[PDB]
Design a protein around this ligand. Structure first.
Ligand code: COA
Ligand code: COA
Lengths: 377, 372
């Protein structure tokens, strides 16, 4: 038997935050300073063609004279983020074709909200999940969160397979980083520390439905991929390579310059560990060649993709869906890997030919690479 | 079977008794009706001891300003994480196995938010293997101890499915007194009495769970087997407890109706647990609460009383639960583990044991454990 992905959907926010838009927001509230000018200059070189915010150009978020309080940042996530998550979740359930009250597990993730109850609880009510649905809300993982959620759900579902009962997991990732855009601009102006987070991140929610294959119903979509194995690797390191630190007005991002370098060193090691821990693949030497797999890589930044591409012996065309998600959507944190799976799914529906095995990889906090291997059924 | 094979807890070292709290409060606020009412309630909680990571002479209690959120985070890192690594180390010691053979880490807190989370730091402090499989739970509050057990239980069943060894370290770490200065200031400004000031204390606790595969001679045999875990979310407009983010940390809102809801929902929660347990669901005697041992998260004294009456139990049935509350107070997600520890220690009881605790989203987490 095996655990499979049986539904996929994503929903970026609706309002463009292009380079012109960001410049207009920045110069509205701050005088020219060298950090402001460097940030804007870098912004135009990200090679992101589109990213999106839940806040339209005329929204008060971009015009108010004050920085949103943390409580306001919370309310904004509830007002804009949760509906985005409910839509993406509903669409994934629709793709799956099954019924909401037959979902047994909910695995949710965000790094742009902290609340008690968490947004997973709200989602249960909005989607009409059963009263005994088994919820998990992941924290502390950041961009590794999409793969982290798949890893957890994969094992939970194997646990139900152990008991011989049906299990269907909804994975939901919800990120609204533009909520913190005003705070980050203000910090960058005050410290004159250039923050490339201003340039990279956008708003999105995405979801998967996974099944353990027990008690399959005719209404359910057959397996898109099977999940064979997931393997995280935490690498040695003084401090993390990215931080998202709490403060009075929300979270502040610290993005280390060394990320592309470290990506080049660690991704091949991560991949090697993934294969060696996969009993059905660990023995044969050919399984340790990256080009024998399709690839999906979390595009933390353009240079991050380049670094992985070169280190893995791949071509940019191998990573086409990863570049495409980055180019149209930007870095949407935990949701990005799901947007890439959707792109890959959609391309296969259009006669495209892809490898039989597919590796997912993404950096998560604690210098930890999350990886997964998926197989075509 | 998935089993619990190691248990440990560690409350913070400094007493926060009634005299101490009053001294802190009057140091910074002139008398107001809400202040006097809070202090009056504080002396009626029937908590004999609760603890803080902050000594009476610590700047936390003397500084004229309310700590920033960044400070609150640093404080958790400085005092909370060492408490967590001590509890974790001691649970691993109780287990008897070696750190790099822990396969899963399930951590939980509601008194810190960080990227990376405190789970990552613990991996390094404890020397867990580089591919240890971490999960940091959020949004669950006092239900987190049982929530963590529920998650770890299923993950380990997942390894049983693959036929491989699994050992899960569960770690709960709560330092609510970090937010005591902010809560006092909010209560003063709004004159809204906040009983959170009276109930909560600092503590870390840990469990080791095993799926029983690849058992080594050095490992402690099963203390309990975990048979089933079952959460029930009940209908309701707003939660019965909130822990809401704001500029200087989190602010607690504790609803007056909790004990009443406890009486209504706990029996339903129990019934759902048994009906969802194939090996018990059929026999009608299994639906009688007094046929089980009980551990219940003591959100407050009146919460214990409500569950006790509604389940037809005695206070002696809930002795370990009252004892944890009396000596340690409400330590959030860690409390259920402190109760398991007491129960284990007393043994060194009935064949089956039910755990129950309120978690956010009006959700009751429950578990059924059995004697091996
Ligand atoms: C930001 C980025 C798109 C710029 O692309 P580019 O212009 O082709 O790259 P360059 O090396 O020419 O960088 C241009 C400028 O960006 C600056 N820059 C790059 N990464 C930076 C970082 N993490 N923080 C601050 N500045 C940074 C460089 O210092 C350089 O400044 P200069 O013009 O004063 O010399 C690219 O460097 C990138 O993708 N970086 C990875 C971002 C990342 O780590 N993402 C993960 C987030 S968790
Ligand atoms: C707080 C507590 C220990 C007080 O014990 P008690 O004095 O025997 O209980 P009483 O009913 O006499 O309450 C005394 C006072 O506490 C007040 N009080 C009780 N619960 C309160 C709450 N949640 N918020 C604010 N005030 C509260 C009562 O209004 C009453 O005020 P009054 O004396 O001015 O009329 C008890 O009410 C309790 O344990 N409640 C449960 C707390 C809870 O829900 N905890 C869960 C945290 S998630």
């Amino acid at each position: 038997q095996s655990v499979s992905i049986v539904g996929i959907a994503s929903r970026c926010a609706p309002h463009k935050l292009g380079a012109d838009e960001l410049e207009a927001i920045a110069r509205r509230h701050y005088s020219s300073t060298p950090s402001l000018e460097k940030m804007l200059e870098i912004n135009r070189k990200t090679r992101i063609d589109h990213r999106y915010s839940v806040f339209s150009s005329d929204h008060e978020h971009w015009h108010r004279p004050t920085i949103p309080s943390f409580s306001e940042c919370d309310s904004l996530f509830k007002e804009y983020g949760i509906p985005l998550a409910s839509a993406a979740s509903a669409r994934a359930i629709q793709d799956w074709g099954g019924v909401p009250d037959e979902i047994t597990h909910l695995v949710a993730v965000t790094c742009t909200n902290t609340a008690h109850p968490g947004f997973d609880s709200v989602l249960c009510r909005k989607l009409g999940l059963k009263c005994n649905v088994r919820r998990v809300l992941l924290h502390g993982i950041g961009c590794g969160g999409g793969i982290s959620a798949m890893r957890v759900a994969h094992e939970l579902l194997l646990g139900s397979t152990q008991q011989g009962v049906p299990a269907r997991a909804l994975i939901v990732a919800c990120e609204v980083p533009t909520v913190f855009a005003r705070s980050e601009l203000d910090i960058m102006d005050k410290t004159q520390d250039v923050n490339v987070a201003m340039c990279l991140f956008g708003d999105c929610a995405a979801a998967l439905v996974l099944s353990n294959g027990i008690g399959h119903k005719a209404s359910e979509q057959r397996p898109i991929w099977n999940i064979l194995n997931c393997e995280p690797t935490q690498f040695d390191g003084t401090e993390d390579i990215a931080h998202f630190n709490v403060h009075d007005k929300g979270y502040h991002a610290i993005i280390d310059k060394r990320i592309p370098q470290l990506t080049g060193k660690c991704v091949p090691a991560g991949f090697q560990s993934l294969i060696s821990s996969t009993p059905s693949l660990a023995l044969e030497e050919k399984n340790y060649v990256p080009s024998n797999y399709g690839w999906a890589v979390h595009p933390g930044g353009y240079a991050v993709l380049v670094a992985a591409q070169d280190a893995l012996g791949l071509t940019a065309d191998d990573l086409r869906a990863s570049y495409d998600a980055y180019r149209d959507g930007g870095n949407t944190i935990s949701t990005t890997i799901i947007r890439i799976l959707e792109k890959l799914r959609d391309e296969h529906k259009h006669g495209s030919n892809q490898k039989d095995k597919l590796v997912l990889a993404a950096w998560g906090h604690g210098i930890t690479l999350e990886t997964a291997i998926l197989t075509r059924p």
